[PDB]
Amino acid sequence: ADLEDNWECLNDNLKVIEKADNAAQVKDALTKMRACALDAQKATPPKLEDKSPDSPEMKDFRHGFDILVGQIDDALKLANEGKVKEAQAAAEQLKTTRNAYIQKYL
């Protein structure tokens, strides 16, 4: 229920998407990613407990999640049109956002 759990939820569902055979499986996993991303967005990461809630780093942290959620939405749109492989490729790129925006605060 904490950050770390929500982060590993992103990792597990990225694996679900990588291994998926159909669009419905990709949609389910992207749904879980989005829910976990929203919960993570509300946490205070271990690099920033001393900082003010409105600090530039905390801004960075939460905006990494707004960016991530928007990209999850873009992948969901692909999956909702049945474009499985396109949705899987979009999900791979979610890793680049996750790594560049959020990892440095964990």
Residue numbers in the entry: 1 to 106
Per the authors:
Previous studies showed that proper introduction of disulfide bonds could stabilize the flexible region of target proteins and reduce the conformational entropy by locking the protein into single desired conformation. Here we developed a comprehensive disulfide bond prediction algorithm that not just increased the success rate of predictions but also improved the quality of crystallized target proteins. We applied our method on two proteins which were previously determined to high resolution and frequently used as fusion partners for GPCR crystallization, cytochrome b562 (BRIL) and Flavodoxin, and verified our prediction by solving the crystal structures of the wild type (WT) proteins and mutants. The theoretical and experimental results both indicated that with relatively lower values of conformational entropy, proteins would be more stable and readily crystallized to higher diffraction resolution.
The continued disulfide omitted electron densities of the side chains suggested that the disulfide bonds are successfully formed in all crystallized mutants, which are T9C-A36C, A20C-Q25C, V16C-A29C, and K27C-A79C in BRIL and N14C-C93, A43C-L74C, and C102-R125C in Flavodoxin, respectively. These disulfide bonds are located near the middle of helices I and II (T9C-A36C and V16C-A29C) or between helices II and III (K27C-A79C), thus directly strengthened the linkage between these helices. The BRIL proteins with disulfide bonds T9C-A36C and K27C-A79C have lower entropy, consistent with better diffraction qualities. For BRIL proteins, the simulation B-factors are consistent with the experimental values.
